[PDB]
Design a protein around this nucleic acid. Structure first.
Ligand code: MG
Ligand code: MG
Ligand code: MG
Ligand code: MG
Ligand code: MG
Ligand code: MG
Ligand code: MG
Ligand code: MG
Ligand code: MG
Ligand code: MG
Ligand code: MG
Ligand code: MG
Ligand code: MG
Ligand code: MG
Ligand code: MG
Ligand code: MG
Ligand code: MG
Ligand code: MG
Ligand code: MG
Ligand code: MG
Ligand code: MG
Ligand code: MG
Ligand code: MG
Ligand code: MG
Ligand code: MG
Ligand code: MG
Ligand code: MG
Ligand code: MG
Ligand code: MG
Ligand code: MG
Ligand code: MG
Ligand code: MG
Ligand code: MG
Ligand code: MG
Ligand code: MG
Ligand code: MG
Ligand code: MG
Ligand code: ZN
Lengths: 23, 84, 69, 69, 181, 117
RNA sequence: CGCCUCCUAAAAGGUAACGGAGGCGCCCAAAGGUCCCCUCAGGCGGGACGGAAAUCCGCCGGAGAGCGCAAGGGUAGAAGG
RNA sequence: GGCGACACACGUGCUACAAUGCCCACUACAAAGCGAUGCCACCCGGCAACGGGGAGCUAAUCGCAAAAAGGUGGGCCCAGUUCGGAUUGGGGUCUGCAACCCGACCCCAUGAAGCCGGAAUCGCUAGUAAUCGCGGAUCAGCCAUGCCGCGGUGAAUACG
RNA sequence: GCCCGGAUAGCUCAGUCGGUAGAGCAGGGGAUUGAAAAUCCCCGUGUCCUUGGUUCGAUUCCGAGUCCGGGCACCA
């Protein structure tokens, strides 16, 4: 679901972080 | 959009040209090149000439246009249509 | 009027959302409702609910007079 | 000589087995102030028609000018 | 008849307000509601599922009154329209039931319209009567979601003894007809 | 048309049932089941009119949704159009707004390919 | 090539030409009997989708509508619905 | 200002069309490189982008650093959906003189096409294909889904 | 001039006795070729000759015109 920035999966793909992938 | 940390951006070689008229004598033709300039509250009601790579475009300014630049009101590519 | 074919209208009880009670008549003698006339934003003065937005656009934008002269 | 500028096409395409033949040219032609001469503008953009096929596409417009309609 | 809220409001609160405003010299000269007539303009009942007594339960529940069918006056090509074709339901409301419908029309339904910016302050007959056009029918209190099969709006004709728009305006106003502008 | 202007799909959880409304995404379905205090793993059908009205008043009052949100959206677009800026010009024609390329692709802002002879 | 309608036909009837124009060789079990009840086209204003024209409300409208089909006569104080 | 145009046509790719699937939380196992106006621990602030601090390291020292798929349990139950993430609205974060043309990133709302693709046609013979993530060159930033490298899990078939 | 018939897609022709029209070829998109044919997958599309009329509606039914094909103009 990698074009989905609204998720872990999609934020890993783009290699970023946020509320949706917290570090 | 820019980072609010900094103050909004205006070339300062134009805003001097926005304010000097308000107290000297409003107004004549302001021929600019700074398409990058946020539209200031003090510009409103004025006529300024935004360049588009060849031609100085007349842009009269209203209280519904301010946040956007001077470049949004002078497109550079001239298109018309296709296959007409 | 004509028998057999008309929905019988009876003493009815419409309860709205804002706790509003109306005492009209109907074909269903108790009825429950979303929004109405003692609550709808157009009916109670000027409740813009959330959005007195308004013409904040534009130059309320100020922020600020932060350019030298 | 003519009495109103026109824009026309010339499609010489004969493809039916290798044999060849493709020659395509669209032009504008207008009447000059009399006494002028023959004016020829290579307003071809890029190589849409290759450089080599332009000497002999004047020599074809030029040749067929020897006899008016 | 029977005691009903919007009627009491007409007689003991709406009348005298008017009587002031326009200075009528006679108790009959003073605006009354003549009748209210609802009409599903319809025609989706042409060559398609012709029988829609479904709509006529929709009205039926709204008004407490079963509507009459309107048949096609003249045949028409471009509307897929054969003369004699049922192309609309129509119901004529007077007296108590007019009051009752109008009662719930204003206390409930027009609010229950999405995007309700208020009734058109221009829809006036030129001779004292007024018209509003509705877009669907869940709008009304007794019409639910698990009953609908389609979205049939309707026309509403509010017909009145006023001789001028001015007087008509005042009347409907006083009863609480929301006038956008 | 219970909450808000659109009735919600029973049998399916509420934290998505409220996403089945224009203007309300999963993070807003997130914050409204903690602020009106209803368990998110209960269906629309296993409610009481208590939970319903707490939800309906809360949801409807806080933000703006449905036609009104739409109203302001297109209005925002309309003003952008009216001036009229680049950001609005590309609403006039039907070409991308956010600075795209269109030589190929762009088939959503443009739709069905108008194949040309 | 028979039959119908109008004109020619000279204000009764009738009246010709390879004179001017059109129609008929059907139809309808209701499109018949009778009782009862309704009145049109069109114009303007009003009204969701709905448009020149669908259906709805108002005002004006003596007949210009309708009368299965040509035309003519007739016709709402009905022959119309 | 343009090389980012858009009626259109082709190439190579990414991401999908779901249940051997997708989300949320808990817990594991890589390599190869990179890093002194560079890498940034941990602490706090904000849902976050990031910002204010601030320890250590010219680095088999400190770091970038979680690898991901997977394993444990729970949630959705075949729906254009808790598949899909395009497009659009508003608000933000950093680079940089400046983000309109024309930047990446975050969050809020939007939740399109796409139900496995005509004719045609590519790759692959084993740690290969397939799938999963990491690094670097370039570089202020990044339009990388590109490129060159890294390891994780790990097939099928070859009569002829 | 008289009699019959015909005008429907770029071309050559089906069809309609009333509502939304077809074939072959040419033309357009793509596949195939080093390339051009040939082949393969998709394509569309006409105010159905002009005019007047009957119909709610006409390519269609009725009158007329035009151009075209056929035939006849004899005793003289
Ligand atoms: Mg995948
Ligand atoms: Mg100042
Ligand atoms: Mg040869
Ligand atoms: Mg009016
Ligand atoms: Mg009146
Ligand atoms: Mg939603
Ligand atoms: Mg006589
Ligand atoms: Mg006699
Ligand atoms: Mg005679
Ligand atoms: Mg009869
Ligand atoms: Mg009779
Ligand atoms: Mg009878
Ligand atoms: Mg009339
Ligand atoms: Mg009208
Ligand atoms: Mg309709
Ligand atoms: Mg008559
Ligand atoms: Mg006839
Ligand atoms: Mg440039
Ligand atoms: Mg380029
Ligand atoms: Mg393609
Ligand atoms: Mg790519
Ligand atoms: Mg959907
Ligand atoms: Mg689909
Ligand atoms: Mg999703
Ligand atoms: Mg934006
Ligand atoms: Mg920029
Ligand atoms: Mg989804
Ligand atoms: Mg499926
Ligand atoms: Mg698949
Ligand atoms: Mg396949
Ligand atoms: Mg080999
Ligand atoms: Mg990488
Ligand atoms: Mg981009
Ligand atoms: Mg032909
Ligand atoms: Mg036709
Ligand atoms: Mg005709
Ligand atoms: Mg002889
Ligand atoms: Zn209420």
């Amino acid at each position: 679901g990698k074009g989905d920035r609204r998720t872990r999966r999609g934020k890993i793909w783009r290699g970023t972080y946020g509320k949706y992938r917290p570090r | 959009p820019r980072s609010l940390k900094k103050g909004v951006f205006v070339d300062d070689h134009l805003l001097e040209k926005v304010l000097e008229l308000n107290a000297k004598g409003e107004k004549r033709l302001i021929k600019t090149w700074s398409r990058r300039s946020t539209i200031v509250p003090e510009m409103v009601g004025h006529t300024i000439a935004v360049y588009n790579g060849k031609q100085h475009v007349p842009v009269y300014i209203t209280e519904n246009m301010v946040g956007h630049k001077l470049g949004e009101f002078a497109p550079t590519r001239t298109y018309r249509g296709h296959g007409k | 009027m004509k028998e057999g074919i008309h929905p019988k209208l009876v003493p009815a009880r419409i309860i709205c959302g804002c706790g509003n009670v109306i005492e009209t008549y109907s074909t269903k003698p108790e009825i429950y409702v979303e929004v109405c006339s003692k609550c709808h934003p157009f009916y109670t003065g000027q409740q813009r609910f959330v959005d007195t937005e308004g013409r904040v656009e534009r130059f309320q934008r100020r922020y600020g007079d932060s350019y030298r002269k | 000589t003519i009495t109103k500028p026109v824009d026309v096409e010339g499609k010489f395409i004969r493809q039916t087995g290798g044999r060849g033949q493709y020659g395509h040219v669209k032009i504008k032609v207008e009447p000059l102030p009399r006494g002028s001469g023959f004016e020829f503008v290579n307003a071809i953009v890029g190589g849409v028609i290759p450089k080599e096929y332009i000497p002999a596409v004047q020599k074809g417009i030029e040749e067929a000018m020897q006899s008016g309609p | 008849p029977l005691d009903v809220a919007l009627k009491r409001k007409y007689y003991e609160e709406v009348r005298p307000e008017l009587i002031r405003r326009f200075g009528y010299q006679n108790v009959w000269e003073v605006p009354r509601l003549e009748k209210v007539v609802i009409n599903q303009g319809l025609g989706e009942a042409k060559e398609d599922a012709r029988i829609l007594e479904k709509a006529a339960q929709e009205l039926a529940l709204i008004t407490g009154q079963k509507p009459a069918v309107t048949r096609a006056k003249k045949s028409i090509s471009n509307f897929k329209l054969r003369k004699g074709m049922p192309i609309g339901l129509r119901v004529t409301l007077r007296r108590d039931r007019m009051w009752i419908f109008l009662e719930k029309l204003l206390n409930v339904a027009l609010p229950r319209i999405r995007d309700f910016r208020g009734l058109n302050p221009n829809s006036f007959d030129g001779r004292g009567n007024y018209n509003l056009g509705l877009r669907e029918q869940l709008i009304f209190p007794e019409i639910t979601y698990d009953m609908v099969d389609a979205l049939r709006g309707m026309d509403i004709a509010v017909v009145t003894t006023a001789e001028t728009d001015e007087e008509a305006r005042a009347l409907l106003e006083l009863l609480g007809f929301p006038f956008r502008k | 048309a219970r909450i808000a202007g659109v009735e919600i799909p029973r049998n399916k959880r509420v934290d998505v049932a409220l996403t089945y409304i224009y203007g309300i995404g999963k993070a807003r379905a997130k914050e409204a089941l903690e602020k009106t205090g209803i368990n998110p793993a209960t269906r629309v059908k296993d409610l009481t009119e208590a939970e319903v009205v707490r939800l309906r008043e809360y949801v409807e009052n806080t933000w703006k949704l449905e036609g009104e949100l739409r109203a302001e959206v297109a209005a925002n677009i309309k003003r952008l159009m009216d001036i009229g800026c680049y950001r609005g010009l590309r609403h006039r024609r039907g070409l991308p707004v956010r600075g795209q390329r269109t030589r190929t692709n762009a088939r959503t802002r443009k739709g069905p390919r108008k194949t040309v002879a």
